[PDB]
Paper text:
Protein tyrosine phosphorylation regulates the production of capsular polysaccharide, an essential virulence factor of the deadly pathogen [name]. The process requires the protein tyrosine kinase Wzc and its cognate phosphatase [name], both of which are largely uncharacterized. VvWzb belongs to the low-molecular-weight protein tyrosine phosphatase (LMWPTP) family. Interestingly, it contains an extra four-residue insertion in the W-loop, distinct from all known LMWPTPs.
Residue numbers in the entry: 1 to 146
Write the structure that this text describes.
Amino acid sequence: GFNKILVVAVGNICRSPTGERVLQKLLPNKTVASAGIAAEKSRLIGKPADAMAIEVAKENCVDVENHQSQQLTSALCSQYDLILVMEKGHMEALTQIAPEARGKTMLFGQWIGQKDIPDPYRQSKEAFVHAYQLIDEAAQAWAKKL
């Protein structure tokens, strides 16, 4: 069974913390965390979720406060049963870091047409609203299957 879920993207400040907390609210019987493939190179480790990501989630009663961006590592992947990436291209970048994690890595937006969810970083609130919408729809579908 998939009990520990890791939501993965690039910076671990916008989509992946949002997906973590949206999914955590829908799946209180699971442990959900998140990480970024390039959090360290982006100089983001320890940073909170983007303020606009927090605000958009808060308007939907999802708490993205007290987040700290962390880097995706092979050791981290071993702690989770299921990994959900925001873009299909993230899978190959992830398996470069943790080739053993291929089998448990799936797409966050699998159930909404296997769609990528684009990064809203450094764009207007509209982009964060769009990202939240896709994350919400995608997470609702995952919650019924885990």
